Amino acid sequence: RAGLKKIDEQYKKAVSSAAATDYLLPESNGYLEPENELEKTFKVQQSEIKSSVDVSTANKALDLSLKEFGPYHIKYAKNGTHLLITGRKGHVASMDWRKGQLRAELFLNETCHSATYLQNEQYFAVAQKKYTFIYDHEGTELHRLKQHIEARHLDFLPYHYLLVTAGETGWLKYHDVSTGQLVSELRTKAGPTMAMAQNPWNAVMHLGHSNGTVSLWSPSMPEPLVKLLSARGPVNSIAIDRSGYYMATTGADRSMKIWDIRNFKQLHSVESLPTPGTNVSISDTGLLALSRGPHVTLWKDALKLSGDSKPCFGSMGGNPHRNTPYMSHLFAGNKVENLGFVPFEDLLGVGHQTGITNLIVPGAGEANYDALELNPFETKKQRQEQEVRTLLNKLPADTITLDPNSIGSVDSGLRSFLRKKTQNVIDERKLRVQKQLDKEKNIRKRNHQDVIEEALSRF
């Protein structure tokens, strides 16, 4: 009791001290509070929001008209300082979207599917046609990954320095950027991969397939960790929140499902989608984004176990319980390709046919980042020191498990021929001796636990 109790106060005193440091957070998140009961938050338009917000916030809501090499897939850097755009016809650009500084621009005459940044913005990978290429900060080709073929989805695990690829061959492959060796290559055996998402809490990969299932993968295991049936047709998109507690999927059957992936319990099944969903994203604050062709719809406080938190399109006579859309926006005559919430910003990046747009979404980003992990105001000296120390503390690939808290639990001539005979006899005696010892133990357990026949019992 004393030993087990004393540990409890040591634990309780630590958590209280950590909570007490919340008084030092330099800022607070945004919101879209309605004043009057008639005023509805999903009637607010980007024109109105730009008017109210300050100059810098309005300048962040970038729009880029690219009519030629679309549609465009976006990806923001983990600290939100750099934007990576890839046109389907092969226009790939890397830039710092605040200071208007272009770090690279490639005009590959090829079909590009997706691109991602590596451990920082100095390096990125592009899933081009038939191969995946890695580039420098300035756009110089470093490597062509010959093993990664027909990859359509890319992701980077930052704490593991791993690059993940998936495509139509049904191959999930892990590549170590630090060492440049194929860590693991797994056969999905489910056909082409329709969607891919990492869980940032345990670094497990979630693949969607055409059979309506979502499988969970780790580099060191040859079979999926878990399989979830979350659609009656192919799964188009998968989104996982920062805590790694919830998962959102959209299939090609006008279905959207919110999952509890710690316990593997389905929470909501929104079947009222007018058209199939194309993309889903979850922000740091937990806002749920959905795109249906030219529409973008947001929900607030939807990732909860309560039944009232179920997302709803519209409202039934203004019923309070129904979770109406938090915000909405329509790109008339323009389809949405993908959605990216800007880290540590109240912005939602949207890649579409015409180019790139950032929508101002109050209460979308994490207002208070931690500079030890990610720093939007990082200097190059801090960037390169952070590069070395994150490389020193690289987590091995085989530490990836469903539960991240698994680690740390108690648990000649004739002479050769004559030598052979003796060793055979020596081994035989060991078996004979062990048989007697086993028999003696059996006796210990046995001991521990007609009138004519009686007469002749002595014989």
Binding site: A20, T21, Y23, L24, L25, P26, S28
Partner: protein, 108 residues
């Protein structure tokens, strides 16, 4: 060790909010100013004028607290950490400045 000094302010700030003298929003503004001063004191090129500014700012926080005590609590002295926290802090700034700049007779 700038964070060591910032965390010493937390128990006082919590006491201010509990007693109702300052709101959480207002307390955040106060700690934002303190964070800037602490970095200024702990950097290169720091002068005695930086300490004087931080002492002057802390004194004004004390005056504002004293007025909200009678205006809100309607008490001369609320028995809690907030009463003597600022005065203790100000004396600590004076010690740090004098040790850093023993030449300045004005600060002494």
């Amino acid at each position: 060790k700038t964070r060591y000094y910032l965390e010493q302010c937390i128990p006082e700030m919590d006491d201010l909010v509990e007693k109702g003298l300052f709101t959480k929003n207002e307390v955040s503004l106060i700690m934002k100013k303190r964070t800037d001063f602490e970095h200024r004191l702990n950097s290169r090129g720091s002068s005695i004028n930086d300490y004087i500014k931080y002492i002057n700012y802390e004194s004004n926080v004390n005056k504002l607290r004293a007025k909200r005590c009678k205006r809100i609590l309607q008490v001369k002295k609320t028995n809690s950490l907030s009463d003597w926290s600022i005065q203790q802090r100000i004396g600590f700034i004076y010690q740090r400045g004098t040790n850093k700049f023993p030449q300045d007779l004005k600060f002494w």
